[PDB]
Every structure is written in C-alpha cells, then in structure tokens.
Amino acid sequence: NITEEFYQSTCSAVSKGYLSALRTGWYTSVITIELSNIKKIKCNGTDAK
Amino acid sequence: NITEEFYQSTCSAVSKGYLSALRTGWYTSVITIELSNIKKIKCNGTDAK
Hints:
Order of helices and strands of chain A: EE
Strand content of chain A: 15-25%
Structural class of chain A: mainly beta
Number of helices of chain A: 0
Oligomer: part of a larger assembly
Helix content of chain A: under 10%
C-alpha cells in the first residue's frame, strides 16, 4: 500500500510502500537460427509460383 | 386402350388400340458454332496455367 508524506519545511515529498526489483547482473544466452547455405537457384522455369 | 385377338384358324394375332406417329418428311436446320481463327500462340512463358 502506497503512502506519501509532504514536508512543508523543505518543500519535498516522499512516497513509501514500494517493493524493489533491481537489475544487479546479467545473464547471457545464445540464440540460434539454422540457415540453409544456398547459392544457385537452378531453374529456368518462368512459372509465377 | 390396347386389345388383342388371336386367330386359331391361321395361327396369328392382332394387337389394336395404338395411335400413329409416322415420319413422312424431313425438316433441315443449320446448326452453327462460331470459331476463333487462331494460329500462333505467341508466348514463351513456361507457366503451368
């Protein structure tokens, strides 16, 4: 539950009640896509498909 | 209504009651199909369709 206090003396306000989720480190994964090595496309067929 | 008589004396029978439809003449009509005069089929396209 979020609460808040305003300090008239210093023209400031503090909002309390929050929970942390701090990124402290890193995890690295390797994502791969298997590719087909193809050069040539041998076909003289002029079909639309 | 079809009727029939058998003659024992001459081993024969006659079937009566029929109505005629005799072809006596001919009527001649000319049926036509409009054709497209085409020779060439100019197209090097090797498409399946």
